C-alpha cells in the first residue's frame, strides 16, 4: 500500500538535471515500485517518464533529464506507482535553483607572500548562469576550528588570492568553495572537493 509522506521537492542546476526528492510511508523499491512523469507546460510537448532511485529505505529520488531550460519554463510533475496516480504538482525551475557545485580547486604558491587558489566555473559560457556566479571560498585550520575564514568572490575570475601573513606556518589548512547566483535568488551549491596544504 503506497502513500507519500513529505511532498516532493525539486531543484534545478539550470543546465540539465533538475533532481527531485520525496519520502514514502514504508520501505519501497523506488526503482521498480514507482515512476516519475514530467512534462513542459507548452504546446506540442509530450510527457516524460523517469525511473526513480532509492534515497533511504523509504526515500525516492529521480533526476529529471531536461535538454534546455529557460526562465519561462513551467513543468508538470506526476508521480505514478503503476496505474494509481498517487500525487501530481508543478515546478518552475528558474524559481528554485541549486547551482552545480564548482570543482578543480587547486592551491598554488606564488612569490611576494601571496597564496593563489584557483577553481573553475562549473557552467559553460552560454549558460544563463555563467555570468551571475559569485563564489564563497572557505579556508580553515585542522585542529583549530576557530581558525576558519570565508572569502566572498564577486568578480568573474574564479580565483582568490589571500596573503601568507594570514596563515600559520607548519600548520595544515583546508579549502573548499561553493557558488551561487544572486540574480536568480538561488541557494548555495554543494561544497567543492576539499584541498590540503601546509606553509
Amino acid at each position: 500500500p503506497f502513500k507519500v509522506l513529505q511532498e516532493p521537492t525539486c531543484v534545478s542546476d539550470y543546465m540539465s538535471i533538475s533532481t527531485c526528492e520525496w519520502k514514502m510511508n514504508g520501505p519501497t523499491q523506488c526503482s521498480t515500485e514507482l515512476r516519475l512523469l514530467y512534462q513542459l507546460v507548452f504546446l506540442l510537448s509530450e510527457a516524460h517518464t523517469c525511473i526513480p532511485e532509492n534515497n533511504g529505505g523509504a526515500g525516492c529520488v529521480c533526476h529529471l533529464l531536461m535538454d534546455d531550460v529557460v526562465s519561462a519554463d513551467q513543468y508538470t510533475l506526476d508521480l505514478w506507482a503503476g496505474q494509481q496516480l498517487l500525487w501530481k504538482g508543478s515546478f518552475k525551475p528558474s524559481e528554485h535553483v541549486k547551482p552545480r557545485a564548482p570543482g578543480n580547486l587547486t592551491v598554488h604558491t606564488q612569490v611576494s607572500d601571496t597564496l593563489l587558489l584557483t577553481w573553475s566555473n562549473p557552467y559553460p559560457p552560454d549558460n544563463y548562469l555563467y555570468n551571475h556566479l559569485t563564489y564563497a571560498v572557505n579556508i580553515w585550520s585542522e585542529n583549530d576550528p576557530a581558525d576558519f575564514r570565508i572569502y566572498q568572490v564577486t568578480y568573474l575570475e574564479p580565483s582568490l588570492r589571500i596573503a601568507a601573513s594570514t596563515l600559520k606556518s607548519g600548520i595544515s589548512y583546508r579549502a573548499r568553495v561553493r557558488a551561487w547566483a544572486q540574480c536568480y535568488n538561488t541557494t548555495w551549491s554543494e561544497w567543492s572537493p576539499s584541498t590540503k596544504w601546509h606553509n
Partner: protein, 295 residues
C-alpha cells in the same frame, strides 16, 4: 504563372547617404493579383517583400550598390515573376586613391562626437577636408566646425546629446577633387564614457569596500566595471572584472577579498558600456583618479 516586371526604376539620395529607390507597378498584370513587390541587393543579399513601390536604406556610398526588384501576387514561395529589373548607384566622382582613410568616430560620454581620419594615398598637399553629419533629429545636414589636428591625423568634433539611431558621416574636400568618404556610426555602439569617481574605501575585517560614482550620463545597470588594485609592498598588480556592482544615488559598490590594512592598496576603476543596453562593449573609459587606503 509570372507577372510583368516593374516600371522606370529610379534612384536618388537624400540626407548624406540615405539611398532611396522608387518604381511603378507593372503593365497589364493580373487583375486578380494582390500586388506585392520583392526586392534585394546584389547577390540576393538582404531580401524584403512589401506593397510599397519604394525601399530606402541608410548605407555608405563608398562602394556601388544595386537593388533588384521583382513582382508577386502573394507573400509565399510563389512562381516568382523571374524578371528582375534593377538599378544601381555608383560612388561620387572622385577617384578611390584620394578619399580619406581610417575615418573613425567615438561618441564621447554621450555629449559630443569625435571623428578622425588620415589623407588618401593620392591626395593633393593642399586639399581642405570638411566633415558633414546628419541624423533624424537635425533640421538639415550640419557642417562640423570644431576641427583639430593631431600628429598626422585630421579630425572634427560636434555636440551630440541624448533624449534605431545612427549618425551619417561624410568627409570630402572644399574643391570637389577628392573622393568622398562615408561612415554610418551605430550610435548604440562606439560609446566611451567618462571615468568614474571613487567616493571612499572602507576596510571592515580585511574586506575592502569600494564605493564609486559612475559617470553622470549613464545608468549603473548599463555599465560593466573593472577594478584595479595595486600593492606597494607585495608589488601585486591586480584587476577584477565586475558586472554587478550593487550596494546594501549614482553610486556602485564592490568588495575586494583577502587584503590587509597593514599594506598600502592603490585603487582605480574604469568603466564600459555593456551588451545588455549597448550594441558593443569594447571602448573602456579612462582610469579614474587613484585612491589608496593605508600602509
Amino acid at each position: 504563372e509570372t507577372q510583368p516586371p516593374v516600371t522606370n526604376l529610379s534612384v536618388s539620395v537624400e540626407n548624406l547617404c540615405t539611398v532611396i529607390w522608387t518604381w511603378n507597378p507593372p503593365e497589364g498584370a493580373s487583375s486578380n493579383c494582390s500586388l506585392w513587390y520583392f526586392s534585394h541587393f546584389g547577390d540576393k543579399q538582404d531580401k524584403k517583400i512589401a506593397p510599397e513601390t519604394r525601399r530606402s536604406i541608410e548605407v555608405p556610398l563608398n562602394e556601388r550598390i544595386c537593388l533588384q526588384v521583382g513582382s508577386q501576387c502573394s507573400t509565399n514561395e510563389s512562381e516568382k515573376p523571374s524578371i528582375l529589373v534593377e538599378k544601381c548607384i555608383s560612388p561620387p566622382e572622385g577617384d578611390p586613391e584620394s578619399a580619406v582613410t581610417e575615418l573613425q568616430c567615438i561618441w564621447h560620454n554621450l555629449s559630443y562626437m569625435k571623428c578622425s581620419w588620415l589623407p588618401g594615398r593620392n591626395t593633393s598637399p593642399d586639399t581642405n577636408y570638411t566633415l558633414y553629419y546628419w541624423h533624424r533629429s537635425l533640421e538639415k545636414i550640419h557642417q562640423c566646425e570644431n576641427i583639430f589636428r593631431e600628429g598626422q591625423y585630421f579630425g572634427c568634433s560636434f555636440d551630440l546629446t541624448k533624449v534605431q539611431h545612427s549618425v551619417q558621416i561624410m568627409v570630402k574636400d572644399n574643391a570637389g577633387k577628392i573622393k568622398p568618404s562615408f561612415n554610418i556610426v551605430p550610435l548604440t555602439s562606439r560609446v566611451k564614457p567618462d571615468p568614474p569617481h571613487i567616493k571612499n574605501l572602507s576596510f571592515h575585517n580585511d574586506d575592502l569596500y569600494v564605493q564609486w560614482e559612475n559617470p553622470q550620463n549613464f545608468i549603473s545597470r548599463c555599465l560593466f566595471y573593472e577594478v584595479e588594485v595595486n600593492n606597494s609592498q607585495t608589488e601585486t598588480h591586480n584587476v577584477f572584472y565586475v558586472q554587478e556592482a550593487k550596494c546594501e544615488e549614482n553610486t556602485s559598490c564592490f568588495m575586494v577579498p583577502g587584503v590587509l590594512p597593514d599594506t598600502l592598496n592603490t585603487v582605480r576603476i574604469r568603466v564600459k558600456t555593456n551588451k545588455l543596453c549597448y550594441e558593443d562593449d569594447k571602448l573602456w573609459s579612462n582610469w579614474s583618479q587613484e585612491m589608496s587606503i593605508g600602509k
